[PDB]
Amino acid sequence: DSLIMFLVEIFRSLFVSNCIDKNIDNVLLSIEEMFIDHYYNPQHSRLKYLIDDVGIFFTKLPITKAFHTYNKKYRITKRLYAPPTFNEVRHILNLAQILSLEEGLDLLTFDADETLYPDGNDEVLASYISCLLKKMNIAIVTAASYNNDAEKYQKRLENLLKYFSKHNIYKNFYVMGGESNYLFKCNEEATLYSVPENEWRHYKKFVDYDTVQEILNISEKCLEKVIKDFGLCAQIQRKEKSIGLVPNKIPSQKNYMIKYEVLEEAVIRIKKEIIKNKITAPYCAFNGGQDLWVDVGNKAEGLLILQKLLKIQKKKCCHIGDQRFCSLTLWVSNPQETKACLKSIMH
Amino acid sequence: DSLIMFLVEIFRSLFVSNCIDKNIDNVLLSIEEMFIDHYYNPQHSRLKYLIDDVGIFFTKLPITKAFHTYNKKYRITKRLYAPPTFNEVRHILNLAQILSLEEGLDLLTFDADETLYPHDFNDEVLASYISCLLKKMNIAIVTAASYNNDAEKYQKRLENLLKYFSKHNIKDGSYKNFYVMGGESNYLFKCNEEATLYSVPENEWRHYKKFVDYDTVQEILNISEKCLEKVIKDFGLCAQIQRKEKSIGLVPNNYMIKYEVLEEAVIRIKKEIIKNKITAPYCAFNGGQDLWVDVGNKAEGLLILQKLLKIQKKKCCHIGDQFLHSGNDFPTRFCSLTLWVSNPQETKACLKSIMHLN
Amino acid sequence: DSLIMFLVEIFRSLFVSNCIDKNIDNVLLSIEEMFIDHYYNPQHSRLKYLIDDVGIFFTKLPITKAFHTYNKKYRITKRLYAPPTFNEVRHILNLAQILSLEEGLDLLTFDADETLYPDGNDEVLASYISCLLKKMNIAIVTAASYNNDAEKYQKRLENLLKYFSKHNIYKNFYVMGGESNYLFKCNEEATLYSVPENEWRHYKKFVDYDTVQEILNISEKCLEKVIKDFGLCAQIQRKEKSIGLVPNKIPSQKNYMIKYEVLEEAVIRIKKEIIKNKITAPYCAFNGGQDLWVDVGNKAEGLLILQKLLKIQKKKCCHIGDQRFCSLTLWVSNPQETKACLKSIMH
Amino acid sequence: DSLIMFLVEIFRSLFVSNCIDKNIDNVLLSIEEMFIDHYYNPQHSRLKYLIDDVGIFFTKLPITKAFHTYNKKYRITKRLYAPPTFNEVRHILNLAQILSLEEGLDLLTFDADETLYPHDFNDEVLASYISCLLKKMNIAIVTAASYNNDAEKYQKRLENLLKYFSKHNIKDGSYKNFYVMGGESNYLFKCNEEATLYSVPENEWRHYKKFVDYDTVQEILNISEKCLEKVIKDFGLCAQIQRKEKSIGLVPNNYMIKYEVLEEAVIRIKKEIIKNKITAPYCAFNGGQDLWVDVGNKAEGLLILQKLLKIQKKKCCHIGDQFLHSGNDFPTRFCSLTLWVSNPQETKACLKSIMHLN
């Protein structure tokens, strides 16, 4: 991330010049003003000249207030031998984006790929998530596709729903499967039903069936090449609007393992070949540590569906994931961070 | 750490020139010839000029065969968009060091703290590998944990592995060839037929350990005590200080402590200890959520077993997980063969590869 | 230059792996094939994936033959402590591009900004340039504009023409003023006349007069801002299709000096502001160490004029300058290098 | 070289954060406070920790005033697309070192080889600056050129500057306060009323120069002679070897030699000389088209004048052009104040700024 680096180099220079524990507010306010000017002029701001991939700011980032708030609690400027690190500046930018939600947020989305759990939960999470549900809409997005088989989505994340049956009552909880292709809701008794197409068919970006089938054919061709090239013991699974690469199960249980480097290569191979056919339709190929899934859809399309379905402005939506231009983003990497951010959001 | 990065930068240029999946043997052989010259002339080798902190090669290293063998199993050179990574070159140098044990392997030492268990030992697969290797050679387990020669405390985290020896490795007499060191290089133990850890008096083998005055031991503990007390007040910690003989540490109450706070305090301790020009052996070990300062280093502990068991330096190998410059495994590169590792799964793999004696 | 760096990193790894003085031909041939594949597929080659700004190859670069030829003469691989440097790899790429001219070259162009002389020549140059003129067309390009006043172009480079009056006889020598706006030729007796517009008016890229006047107005506004901001003692000079920033003359001779850093800033300021008005017309702002000149034109337009006027394929044109996609380029920085390259071209 | 890069990296971050043209005094003052602590405690300063080869600050450095004054004259902070460059920070540290001469300047030394003339001295403006400063303090000219105490040869390249002293600086008696050193630190000279360079016997001031055995002098010359002979054959040079007493060099016949060939040969000479553990003073000076090895360094030469003229270390300043790590001016940072320069134009500028005594 060039935005985090950008700040890391600056903090490193203040640290090595021996004034980082002094009053650096003159530098922080000059940085904050560049952020705010980019908020009004995302296309031609000077911040755009420094960071080409800066993206878009839906909020006025209070980075100065975030630095003081982070420094007071963790006291990183008292360090004499290690300047602020990449991971620490990452939490500061999360805090700045959390703090920028002064007007409140009505939509909160969770990337449930790996950030939330390795397998099937956390009660402190479920307790914190439930508190937020009464305040505003929440949503959970999965890259796995089981078509519309609602029972399969429940198996991967059933424990958190058990808390919701108690201490709730409500209808402000949503689950998105296939990245942006299947949207479910919740009734009363430990539920998992699918909203009909009429409620959200128009909001989905229009794509042809043959175009959808074309992407899966291209991805199917690449994975076979990946399987044969790296000699993996794996099987390909094609679905309606998705295709996935899964490892073989050890005969007897537990499944075999694919090296993480090979999965990262296949994602680049698939993404590159899709661009070769000049396909403009939305798509995404996600690596889940042990699985590879290609969906005809992306988090951006699914995020827009929820904003348009629930009539929420983009400034009131927030996303938490391990990995764009349509919602505020918090970068985490473990469930404890997800609960750590959610604890800060409670105010 | 820098030898690995040395190879990563080279393989990156081969990948980038589109020839890494071709025959790169002329480059690899030139690298191997440099490893041979460092093996023969460690003090003024060409490799020492390129890499100052390279360490000592106690054996000739088949780096070409390792790359060739590792590529045949993992096909890393078939990748179009990812050059050989840091961990893959790490695995390559691991196998090259294993293949350099053609002469034999008399002693094998493992880090207790993190290469064997998350903590409580609870891996039946790992211990089943350990028993077979134990039959053919002596093994030892080195921990930074410090209990003042209390064999009951050390056996707690290692109960299952020791209890395994009773059912499979008790009759063959292999139990005598198993040792445990506590406080890095302060308390040595051994096993009996009842699968229990018993003690060996520090007076029995103090001839092999460089003595340190009791006042200088307490000197190091008091300097560290001041730094840890200053560190707690500086960052507003919730943790407390626990002191024992020949060892002091920072322990929470359990509130997790940030990694950066622990790492700098190691630097402050090491920097302030240097300010008094202390030449005694010591180490500031950074744990997951704790910090510990011991009088004595793993290098001294590994030297004791070599002198005690009369084992040759080239026949001794060590398996540690923290081979970073700040880690306590970094100095052990000068007294034994070393295998960088990260978890039991990787440790069981290196042990599986080691079980090809021939 | 990313292409030169690209090779410097590779040579550095061969050097540090202690095999650079051995047979590195396996690496060089793999590099050469990437160059050749980029020659056939400039838009989607793998070299394009490694070097985004690689440009275009009008020739099959014999980089392997260039390395051996450069190594045999200078013996750089016998070094034990310094790998091949950026400047050395630069000469190799010049040699490779010179060697690629196996089918001969009919056009040779010289960037006369600073590469050829600081002031008004070199007889060894003039002797070498004259030998090439009988073989093929030569051309000299200047950023300075004196409209069509041919006498002023002659004053800056009159000494080389004195050699041409002797040992010649002919009509294959050309001079381009205003980057791409004024084209002159040579008669018999120490000459400097201008070819009429009809011979080359159609080949110039069509641009409106008000558009040309717009660029000079924008550049005039920037230079005044540069003058007032940095407090320079300088005067602005506007012309028909150019505007320049010149320093004041010390009263009494010799002229004042502008710091080189300020001139480089004004070029970026002018170029940036021209893009702000979305001007698509060709232009260039050149820094000449002591002068700044903005021309409505560029070396690319002038190069195309000479190729179309003289009916020469792009594979037979070569340019020598200190600083694109329409001719082969040799990178030099001093007159001795220019004569050094020309000595190699004589075969 | 690394202190300059230290400031360049800091100013780059200030420029990038859009506040460099605002008030950056809090950052600059923190930098100045570090320069004061290094001035007081050079051995274990915080600045030495960040920059290991920083050198010695013989005076407190007004780095803020230098930046403020330099910005007022050149307005570098008004640039939108170019942070302060390497040479601008160099000029800033030059002025800060000049402004640190508030106490006085008794001795000023110039590199003859390249800070005074392209070579033949031929700048009337430079010499006219030299005469005025010569009236108020002693100046000296240090050259790597080696002629065995032949005053006629040294005066050739310096004729115009010496002849200028006869017409303007001969009556005031200032001629006595002007010295010339040859062979870096081997032959000292002086001037008379007739504007001629006369010699001073090396026996007269050998008490100030650390003696070196004649066999060890020839030892260094023979080691260099082997390297240069090997270098010529290695790269197929056309040059030849010229040897004198206490000095040896590589000279063409005049075919220009590549810069990289000269620079590595300096490394080979320095590396091989270190291999014999020679502690004598020496230097391998890289010229434009030649290479020279002298027995004795500029640090020794600058030390002689301080001990001979009894001048204080802080009152001595040096003006050299090659302050790179490989250059011969690099060691002079530990015995005198230093001003990095590149040509007479820059040298006349520093001399012009120096003419504000007050």
Residue numbers in the entry:
A (entry chain B), C (entry chain B): 60 to 179, 183 to 231, 236 to 318, 325 to 395, 406 to 429
B (entry chain A), D (entry chain A): 60 to 177, 180 to 314, 327 to 431
The authors write:
All structures adopt a tetrameric assembly displaying a cross-like shape, in agreement with the quaternary solution structure. Each subunit consists of four domains: an “N-Terminal Regulatory Domain” (NTRD, M1 to K59), an “OD” (D60 to T143), a HAD-like Catalytic Domain (CD, F144 to K270 and K371 to Q444) and a C2 cap domain13 (K271 to N370).
Moreover, deletion of the NTRDs (PfISN1-∆N59) inactivates the enzyme at pH 8, while at pH 5 there is a sixfold drop in activity. This is likely due to its incapacity to stabilize SegmentD394-F407 containing the ubiquitous HAD family motif IV, which is mandatory for coordinating IMP-Mg2+.
